[PDB]
Amino acid sequence: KVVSTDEYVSRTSIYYYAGSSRLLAVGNPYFSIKNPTNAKKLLVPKVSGLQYRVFRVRLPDPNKFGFPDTSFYNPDTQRLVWACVGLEIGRGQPLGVGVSGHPYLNKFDDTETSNRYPAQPGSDNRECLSMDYKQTQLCLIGCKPPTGEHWGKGVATDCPPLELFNSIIEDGDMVDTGFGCMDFGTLQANKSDVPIDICNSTCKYPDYLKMASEPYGDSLFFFLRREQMFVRHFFNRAGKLGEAVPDDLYIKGSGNTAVIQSSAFFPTPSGSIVTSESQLFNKPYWLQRAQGHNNGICWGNQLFVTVVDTTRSTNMTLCTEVTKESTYKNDNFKEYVRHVEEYDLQFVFQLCKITLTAEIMTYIHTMDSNILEDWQFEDPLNKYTFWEVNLKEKFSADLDQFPLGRKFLLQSGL
Amino acid sequence: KVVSTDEYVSRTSIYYYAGSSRLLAVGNPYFSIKNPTNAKKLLVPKVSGLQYRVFRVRLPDPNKFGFPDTSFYNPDTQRLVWACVGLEIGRGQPLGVGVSGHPYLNKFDDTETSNRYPAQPGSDNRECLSMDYKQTQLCLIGCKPPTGEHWGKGVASATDCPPLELFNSIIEDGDMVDTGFGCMDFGTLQANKSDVPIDICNSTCKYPDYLKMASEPYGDSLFFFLRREQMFVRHFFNRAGKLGEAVPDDLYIKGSGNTAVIQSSAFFPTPSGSIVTSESQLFNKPYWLQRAQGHNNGICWGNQLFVTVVDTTRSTNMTLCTEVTKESTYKNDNFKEYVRHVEEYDLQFVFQLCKITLTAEIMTYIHTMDSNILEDWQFEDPLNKYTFWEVNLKEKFSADLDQFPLGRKFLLQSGL
Amino acid sequence: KVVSTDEYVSRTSIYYYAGSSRLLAVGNPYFSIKNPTNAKKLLVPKVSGLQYRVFRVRLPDPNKFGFPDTSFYNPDTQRLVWACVGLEIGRGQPLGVGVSGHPYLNKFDDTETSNRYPAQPGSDNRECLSMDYKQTQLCLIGCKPPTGEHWGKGVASNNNAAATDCPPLELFNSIIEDGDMVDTGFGCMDFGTLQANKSDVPIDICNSTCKYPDYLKMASEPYGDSLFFFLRREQMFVRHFFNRAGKLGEAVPDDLYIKGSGNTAVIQSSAFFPTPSGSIVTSESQLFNKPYWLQRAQGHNNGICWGNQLFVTVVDTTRSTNMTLCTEVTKESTYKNDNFKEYVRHVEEYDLQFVFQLCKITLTAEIMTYIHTMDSNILEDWQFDPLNKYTFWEVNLKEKFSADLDQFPLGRKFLLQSGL
Amino acid sequence: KVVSTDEYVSRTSIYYYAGSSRLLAVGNPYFSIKNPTNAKKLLVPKVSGLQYRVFRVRLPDPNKFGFPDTSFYNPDTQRLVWACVGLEIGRGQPLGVGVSGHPYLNKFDDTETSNRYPAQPGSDNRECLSMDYKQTQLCLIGCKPPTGEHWGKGVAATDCPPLELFNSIIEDGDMVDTGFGCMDFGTLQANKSDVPIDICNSTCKYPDYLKMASEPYGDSLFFFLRREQMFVRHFFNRAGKLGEAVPDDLYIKGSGNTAVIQSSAFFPTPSGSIVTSESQLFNKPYWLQRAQGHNNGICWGNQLFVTVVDTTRSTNMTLCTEVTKESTYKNDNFKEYVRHVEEYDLQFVFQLCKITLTAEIMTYIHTMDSNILEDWQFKEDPLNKYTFWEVNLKEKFSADLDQFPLGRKFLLQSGL
């Protein structure tokens, strides 16, 4: 039913390079700061190494592109499309690791070595703790935005019902950090069971299984992923235990041990060490043969690059002096936290042409009716937030004038 | 006497793909919650990353299957069977590590650096502690369910120590894997219910009996297997209670005064599975079953196959928290805390159709191997007493291999 | 526009070896000490395993070079230039790790396992702590000095009302000079201007700027003179979790928590910061004391040392051991702390080894135009200094070139590797 | 001009095996013990896994060796010399790690997580601490003893000792660097308490690889291997006056309890981390086929130097004697000792070589080392002032290569 694009998309020998140049984001890693005197504007964005970067890369429409020689296709019977054959995700800034925390984290006791009876249950025992998150590197590439999975509140023990949800991963969405891919805002009502940079967020994980089994293969031309973590500490929660331990799993205590302590345990993660050798980025990927049926065809003259890279999640400390005095006083200083991200996206594109026979027109229409409509032979994604990368005026045919271009010519023997 | 299936099972060039689609299990990682007014009515099942997943995969009987053209075999003289030539065990959810504990764990002292005399006295010094378990990945494939080993209470036959006996049993869906405390029946061998965390303290932890399964004459249990285990000692504790076997007098000089009353030498460690990484993953990659080591080269007798999996690398337990009363300031009594765990699978197979010419010698051989094969071919089920995760593929077979992920991989890998 | 040097630079079979011999630096890893008079003299330089070493290597002008027979060179139509084809960065001293600290580090609480309410109030809760930094190995090679990136104080629009008074951040490019500090785990920033309390990082960077190589910019340079070749190995993990004292400049928004009361009414600082750790150093992961053959550069300059000079940039924290020195002010039969003075010193040992290949260029009209657009000084200096404002470790090889390759370690390696 | 020995040293097809047999050293790892009255005699030597082992291996002079048939060379016009073509450094004892410490280590505060103000004053705050040192494996081979580098006191706002880098011959028993650098601790640390006692009155040396590699003739390093590792285990600061105060532009002054600045004379303790079999450099053969330097294994002077550091067997054994036997335990009834042992077994394969004493070759050799021709008869040895572990193989040479382990390995490797 579905066939490879190799069977109805003809390749030319025409290649183009396009680069975004340096992309920077600067903000607060834990939360954005809205403008107090203009509520519709953000004063400081939320910029964190635990966010997805979802780039919507806009390509020049090859059917309107000022090629010097346009005799390679017949506009009466054919249309043009770009194919992505090479990519490098440039990453700036040094390798490093940031931390995240909560001034009122719901940690009660340390349950690793010593937690004797009786409990000391007050009504507000939250503590100001921080941690370093699970480490994640990944890149997804396709002509359709990626699909994530996360757990949320479903439809109806008083435990919230769990439902697995699919959604489009948007630029700025949070990746899972060690506490799972879930809607923490709705499933953790106390706002204190995870650090503040996810406690009112949804952490999403790429739905690799769903995307890979898509018939046309528009979501994943190519992907890399590297995750790691271990358990750094063991805590338990304050609050009522919603599901008591059944009586067949213990002999009751008495006296000092009569009032059972909370078995609502939770670990803290740690991503451990970051190293250059395990970097996925700053090297080229050649999209020669995709596993799916879309062999890199950028339908709609666009392409989506999704990236998570926690290996440069350093958060910088900033400190201002409000009063200059000869001796040190805390009240004379203000402390800030800032995080930055540096990207440089480089592509090699191959021009393709499609002869629109009756059979091919039916196939394309069944696959995506917008393709023929846009070819002349409202955009549904504008409700989503992406990092827009406009390459319409960035295409160059002089491949050997750019780093990735030289690599392509050398690799391909051209 | 036993020969390879390659000698009497004819391979065709007909291949079919079958996939389970998304399989989800959601529950409490530490215990099930029973309906108070029923016994087999579960309100919340026990779903944990430390459980065996034993999938009983039902295949369509090829002798009754709607093939478009069956002219490739003579039903008067031959019977059909599926062979598994490819499989990928898909795993969803992010990598992570969960913890387990006991609100009354029988830990007395930390015995790593400082445990001075004299012994502190008590009758209930249990503590509310947790740990992260040994890390295990494994994958078994066969047309017969897998066999486990575990230590249990033997026969009663200067020590009241329970006798130990090594038991074999079928590993069922939901059985607990060993966690760092060994493969034993904790319910019967640890009578106090407090020496290990609550998710195994009343369970039997089983380890696959690889040696027995591997030495089976016909080799139906293990077409293929992968395994990756690791742990280290994170902490050193000792037990409270009477020491059942005192240290002999030739191993120490007796103390006096504050050291006159000997402290408990019933030590026990806590395990740690250490780090989880993508590179060490066994799953989300294809396995091509070309040449089995045993005599059964992937033949799915009885139109079924058993896929057994342990994967602790996605054992994260999600914290859930409900608000009973909304108030402007934080109060512990206004919230309830829950724990939930989920597992996501996607089993993908490529099967090769095979035919067997039922000569006199071959029927004799097959009857000796398993008399049910010829009876079901027409030329009750003892496994109904066991619990498996049923995966019904009777309506999931497709000849359009290139329309599915594993199907494309198979066509590419085989040059077809 | 830009073409590979392979298209207009002719390679000869003439090879030369040159070595710097042992290069030593000795000083204080945390700060320099000035002569009280003379003020602009250094008494003890600042020498640290966390510094960049930027060697400006001077080569003999091959167009004036005493070759045994120069009849192969026609000065009427061609000029000579050296190409670097082999390099080894020798490192002496044992592998090891140093630590850095601050007697008044702005650490308030340990936020890893226990930090209950209420907070302890004070005005000066600084502590005397130390740490081991992120581990970095790198070496860059080109005929132009390298470019670093670092964050500094930018410009703040004043028409824009500031609800946050946080300093604006700007990414700055600069030439990396010998003695500049590498990033240590707290990022590449100007700590002197962006941390006004002088207490948020150890003293060896608290009044310094830590720089990171701008690899992306250097790689995208049209001619590729900065990076013939580079190697890099970074690693770190989080060793401890602390928070800062001082007023929190950006309060946590009210939608991320339920307010406290009583002991928890005054929120504690969420201005967290980790301490880094470079972890283990091993021989197996060393980048140095091994040869590199510069056969084919990724950029268009395939190792041509224009201007008869070469830049070697090195970071190597794997030998950052700081030696403890102790003098006895008064000899007594029993120990007393006041009888001794404690000092710290650090040393660095280098040995740079090169193999150069002689090249000649026939100066046609087309090539002269190309080179002039590339750099007009090349044709001027050939008869056919802007870098003096920067600080480099000068390595003069003008009189160290030898044709007897097999008389030297790297020369023997080259002859064997190339089959000569 | 220097040329390879390949150009003037003729190889024969004559090979010999030689082995040292078991070499044992037994002593105290921290210090030597003199005879209790007589003092120039040692009762217990200092034997530690942190020492260099420098073996001076004496070979039989081949020009005086009882060969059965000497028609392979002309003794009037030629001289004989041995070339080393194979070597294995045998190591006995199990892998393990020792620790070193000081009963009066100059450690003031733990500066890793908590070191608040004010500093408490004292005059003697030294502590009884220990640590495990940096891990080092290495082996050097040449016909000349190896050269080490270390920092010592040189000549000539700061009273800090001037530093000079010194070269010296590494002798048997010299200390390797341990994590505190290669320096003369006796002269540069006057308090004798800034490092553990096994180096506080010693010089820790590091091989001057750069100097030896650049020697024209290449006599020091036929071949070498090295593997070092460490991390920082703890962070401390020193007591005593700070000799160089922190400049005023690097901090804002304190007040009250923070008025008296604390010592920023930090120092780490090292740790060599784990030792494993897989990273072993020893107990495997090295074939010296073609050296990088110009001396291709020629053992001038009928000797060769094998230098080893191996901290991967640095276990220190605990010994304990009973002075009074009593029914209850008392500390004063026992004496505690520490002992360390090292087990070596050096195995060599040598190839016999001949040199024709032409006018040109005698001139070349005379310029290289005037002693070579003198010793050939065509005298105080200068190395007698240095200490080496003497290994005499004069009576250990055998032509029956296949009767010994390394000999068999050589025959197999070389196709003979």
Numbering used by the authors:
A (entry chain B): 20 to 175, 183 to 403, 437 to 473
B (entry chain A): 20 to 176, 182 to 403, 437 to 473
C (entry chain E): 20 to 403, 438 to 473
D (entry chain D): 20 to 175, 182 to 403, 436 to 473
Reproduce passages from the article:
HPVs are non-enveloped, double-stranded DNA viruses comprising multiple copies of the major (L1) and minor (L2) capsid proteins. The native T = 7 HPV virion can be mimicked by an empty icosahedral shell, called a virus-like particle (VLP) which consists of 72 L1-only pentamers. High-level neutralizing antibodies elicited by L1 VLPs can block HPV infection; however, protection against HPV infection is type-restricted, and there tends to be little cross-reactivity among HPV types. Each L1 monomer folds into a canonical, eight-stranded β-barrel (BIDG-CHEF), with the strands joined via flexible surface loops (BC, DE, EF, FG, HI).
We solved the crystal structures of pentamers of the lead double and triple chimeric candidates H58-33BC and H58-33BC-52HI to resolutions of 2.5Å and 3.5Å, respectively. Further pairwise comparisons of the surface contours of wild types and mutants illustrated that the most distinct bumpy protrusions between parental and targeting types were located on the side-chains of K53H33, N57H33, K59H33 and K60H33 for HPV58 vs. HPV33 (bottom left), and K380H52, S383H52 and E388H52 for HPV58 vs. HPV52 (bottom left). By loop swapping with a few aa mutations on HPV58 L1—i.e., S80N, N82T, N84A and V87L for BC loop, T375K, G378S and D383E for HI loop —the resurfaced structural contours of the BC and HI loops of the chimera nearly recapitulate those of the HPV33 BC loop (middle and right) and HPV52 HI loop (right), respectively. These subtle structural resurfacing changes in the engineered regions might provide structural evidence for the cross-protective immunity of the chimeric proteins. H33-58HI and H58-33BC mutants showed comparable cross-protection potency as that conferred by bivalent HPV33 and HPV58 VLPs against both HPV33 and HPV58. To verify that the residues exchanged on the surface loops of HPV58 introduce a similar functional surface area as that of the corresponding heterologous type, we recruited mAb 4E5—a conformational and type-specific neutralizing antibody of HPV33, the binding of which could be redirected to H58-33BC and H52-33BC-52HI —and determined cryoEM structures of the 4E5 Fab in complex with HPV33 WT VLPs (HPV33:4E5) and both chimeric VLPs (H58-33BC:4E5 and H58-33BC-52HI:4E5). Similar binding occupancies and binding angles (60° for H58-33BC:4E5 and 60° for H58-33BC-52HI:4E5) were observed for 4E5 Fabs bound to L1 monomers of both H58-33BC:4E5 and H58-33BC-52HI:4E5 complexes (middle and right, middle and right). Further analysis of the mapped epitopes suggests that the 4E5 Fab binding orientation and footprints covering both the BC loop and the EF loop are similar for all three VLPs-Fab complexes.
